[PDB]
Design a binder for this molecule. Structure first.
Ligand SMILES: C[SH](C)CCC(=O)O
Ligand SMILES: C[SH](C)CCC(=O)O
Ligand SMILES: [Mn+2]
Ligand SMILES: [Mn+2]
Lengths: 125, 125
């Protein structure tokens, strides 16, 4: 199949969040648990000011596509600023974090080379 | 490795194009041939007004993330307009095309679950 999604497409899907990531919420836009797509999966995340996608890692490589705001990417200990217009590559099992130190919402898509988000087990650093 | 890319980062890289796709050009932002990265690869593409990413297919699944402009996505014969903020899922081997019928540049990222772009074999449909 071929399909098109945007935030409006997933209006009926509630935002997801977890205690370990303060100020972060997300929705699944391309995901086998919702769509029967496979091979790649994609979500959309918002990080509120002060929010932190806490240091973690997981087996699959990952890409972030930053679409709004600015933040601080923790590259396994080395900090680098990121902003709208950036893409980020995270090698499999590399520890990474994303902090929103700005006043605007930090927004990005993530992509995994998996059918679904639930196949990706996130381990804390 | 973990790294960040944007258009500024790849200024030194020349735009790629082929007579196969008039009015289309691209750069590689996350790609084994440039970065030694693996698992996922990503490029940035532009389609000029009247440009056509001609109907084609390839083995791996693909995602588009539209960052600007508007286009007509050909979903194996069923057309749908896409615009900034849309993401597109294309199943492996599904026939797809992307035409820019608008006045502004159609810009998007593409993502493959492959180490590099050059290993993807596209066939005209
Ligand atoms: C935004 S979350 C649903 C997890 C993000 C990540 O693991 O990089
Ligand atoms: C922008 S191109 C380098 C081809 C992308 C695609 O396979 O749809
Ligand atoms: Mn991650
Ligand atoms: Mn394609």
């Amino acid at each position: 199949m071929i399909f098109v999604k945007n935030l409006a497409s997933v209006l009926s899907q509630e935002w997801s969040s977890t205690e370990k990531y303060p100020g972060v919420r997300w929705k699944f836009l391309i995901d086998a648990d919702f769509d029967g797509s496979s091979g790649l999966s994609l979500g959309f995340a918002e990080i509120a000011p002060g929010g932190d996608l806490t240091l973690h890692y997981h087996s699959p490589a990952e890409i972030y596509v930053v679409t709004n705001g600015k933040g601080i990417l923790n590259k396994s200990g080395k900090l680098e600023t990121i902003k709208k217009g950036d893409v980020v590559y995270i090698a499999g099992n590399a520890e990474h974090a994303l902090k929103n130190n700005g006043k605007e919402t930090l927004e990005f898509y993530w992509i995994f080379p998996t059918d679904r988000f639930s196949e990706v087990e996130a381990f804390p650093a």
